[PDB]
Amino acid sequence: VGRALVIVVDDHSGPLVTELLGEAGFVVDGVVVVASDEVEIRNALNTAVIGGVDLVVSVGGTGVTPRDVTPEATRELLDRELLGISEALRASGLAAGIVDAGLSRGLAGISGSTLVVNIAGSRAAVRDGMATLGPLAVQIIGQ
Amino acid sequence: LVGRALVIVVDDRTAGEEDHSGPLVTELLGEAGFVVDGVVVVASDEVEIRNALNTAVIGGVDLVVSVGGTGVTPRDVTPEATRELLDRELLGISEALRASGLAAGIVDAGLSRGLAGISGSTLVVNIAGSRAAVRDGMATLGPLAVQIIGQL
Amino acid sequence: LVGRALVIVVDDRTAHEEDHSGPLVTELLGEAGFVVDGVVVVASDEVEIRNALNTAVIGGVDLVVSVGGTGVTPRDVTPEATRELLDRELLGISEALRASGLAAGIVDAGLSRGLAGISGSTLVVNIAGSRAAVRDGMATLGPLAVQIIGQ
Amino acid sequence: LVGRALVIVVDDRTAHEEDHSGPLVTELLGEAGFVVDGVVVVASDEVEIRNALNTAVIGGVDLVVSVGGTGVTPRDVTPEATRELLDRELLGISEALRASGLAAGIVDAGLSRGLAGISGSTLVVNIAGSRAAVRDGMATLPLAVQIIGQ
Amino acid sequence: LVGRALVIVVDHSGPLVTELLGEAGFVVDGVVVVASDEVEIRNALNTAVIGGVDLVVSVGGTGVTPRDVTPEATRELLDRELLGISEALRASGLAAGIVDAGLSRGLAGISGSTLVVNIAGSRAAVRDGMATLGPLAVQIIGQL
Amino acid sequence: LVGRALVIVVDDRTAHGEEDHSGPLVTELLGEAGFVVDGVVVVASDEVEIRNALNTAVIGGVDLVVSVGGTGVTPRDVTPEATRELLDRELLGISEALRASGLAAGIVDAGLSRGLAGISGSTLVVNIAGSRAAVRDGMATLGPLAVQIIGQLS
């Protein structure tokens, strides 16, 4: 229980992430859409951390093509990394047969007091990714 | 597209407070490429479920999906209602589901007594009632059903 | 106190040598919130196992965990001593255990033919006999048995 | 090393065309430490399959592996063929294979209705028919060596 | 049978880690207790490595809180990292419902010829971790 | 054709004379996964030599390089260190899947492999462990993942 922001990298994801975040027990302060620009994405994350949200979910920008800069945007902001979250989403993704989730370069970790998690872009990856993530997020905001 | 489906919501309160499962199953079956022909609500009652099921198979459907009544209490009797209808168990479905659920921490999906099988030419699958379990089972079921209804 | 438990240890040696599995099951069960009322040692004989199991369900206990006699040899007869008194099979417990065991490298847990199920209002689970299988089974069983006792 | 095995290929095409699975199964059974007595081929028929399984249990072999006939189509009768012959079901084998195949994205392994168990003193295991399913099935099946150990 | 181990507890777990390493095939030379202080931990690990023990298991200090510094303390000691061990423990943890193991920032790796492994603090994590780690440790101690 | 693949076999004994049992098998399995195999390069378990073979294979433009061996934990196992120099981006997900699949199947060298996966230039590079069991399990898990990576890169 806390409050959370969504960041779509340009999607149908924003309303859906809002919904699943809602069911996980989160107030969704809003949806911010940004381009696959490392600076535009980093600016959006940093701004959110400073603003004191408990949780920031990004969606998209985690595949292999050079336009996919979500991870490297994110890494500058992380005080500590939570591979546990990255591994659980990827593991879960493959199991379900969702490959962009299986192969995601998304990070997870803590910036200030905020948990940041990068989820992959496809609808399947958002569903499976929130299902898995929501519990783990809850436990971490608990510190 | 892929096919048609009928959704049975096994719940006493729903049979008549508001159905949440039924819309949700429909939304998710839609993304997998199914049209839901209908949502039938029914009490945790062995016969009522068996009839609902039997009627769906009889009717023009490729996929039947029950939600609820898969637990352990006296009144969870969806598996009992479902067994005679099967011609051939699909244990990999029950297992894929039970395992996905457990992996995700959803003990009612994880511990579901729910079955899976062909009843004639129709895929029947029982799913557990919790929202988490509907969301996970469907994510797991959709591709599996897509490939079973194709080999038929 | 989440509920009470009886332990049945299925081992010839023990029946005819000191019991290692039973104190262990009890430690592990008591971490998951259970109190073990007793350990009952029996031999790998269909009849003995079944009588002990029925006497447990007749003791009214919340959980009965057998240990041993789930393998393939002709004397591993725990599963068939147990089937007759289940009103409902709980495959997802049996599947969870074998899956967990298999992933830990514990082949006897991995391939156990041990059943799980409800007998009246009593949860009944059969676990393989190695110390490894006992330790991994109870970790995996503890939570599931807590929730099922919700009933 | 470990024991002797016989391979039954279930495939109409092959029973009427070069067998693809038989040599592969033999190959992998070898790496797992089995001598293969050889490959019986068999049309996708309940009774014909059943008798080849019978023949093999009676014929003394430690492991019988079936390939194919595990799907949902009507001619997929290998499970029906196999069940009257088991004295003891080993669901944890069926379970492991299914779980492994589905984990690897192999849907005919993942959903296979193939059975596994002990008939007399023989380990019998039905594996699904696709090439991917054979490789994953056999790499998972080690469980074989354990079980023949007793 | 197989090798010598040292337990570092970051402040219950000591006797338990001892018991389970035992069953895994490991003599336990000692149990060192340490106070959640990057410096203290790194030194206990230094000492453990320098004395040539085969396996060092640390317990605790792997969560997200300010004073969870066990990973920071271990990183510079690792010659080679072994994510497969960390992955196996985290995945095992998660499957078993044990979130502290599931989300543990704990590392695994080789320092000198010593296998070092950070396990999370909860009793369940120690049990799940040790059951998983045991055979992995045995195999690595073989190839070293 | 999904693409071209190259096999690098990292094994001192193979390098110093002995028959290569790993290289043909990876050729077959890549065949089935959908790849034409440009050939097999054998290398000793030396970081330079290995780095040089990967670097040459990348610049030559194959879609996929699989290496075999040198992922363990002896001093000699330097495939990861060689590979790391060359990666523009890591696909931790591929390594996680191979380790996870290995462990489940009881194949501990796959389980514990320090293998990397990643993108070098426009080449998918993946280190697999050297055991015969690890090569079979590795290629099975990898084949489809690599199909989907080549396609995102074209």
Author numbering:
A (entry chain A): 8 to 17, 26 to 158
B (entry chain F): 7 to 21, 23 to 159
C (entry chain E): 7 to 22, 24 to 158
D (entry chain D): 7 to 22, 24 to 148, 150 to 158
E (entry chain C): 7 to 17, 27 to 159
F (entry chain B): 7 to 160
From the paper:
Functional experiments then showed that MoaB2 inhibits σA-dependent (but not σB-dependent) transcription and may increase the stability of σA in the cell.
In crystal, the M. smegmatis MoaB2 hexamer forms the asymmetric unit. Each subunit of the hexamer exhibited a weak or missing electron density for the N-terminal residues 1–7, the C-terminal His-tag, and linker residues from the plasmid. The β-sheet is made up of five parallel strands (β1–β4 and β6) and one antiparallel strand (β5), which are located between the inner β4 strand and the adjacent β6 strand.
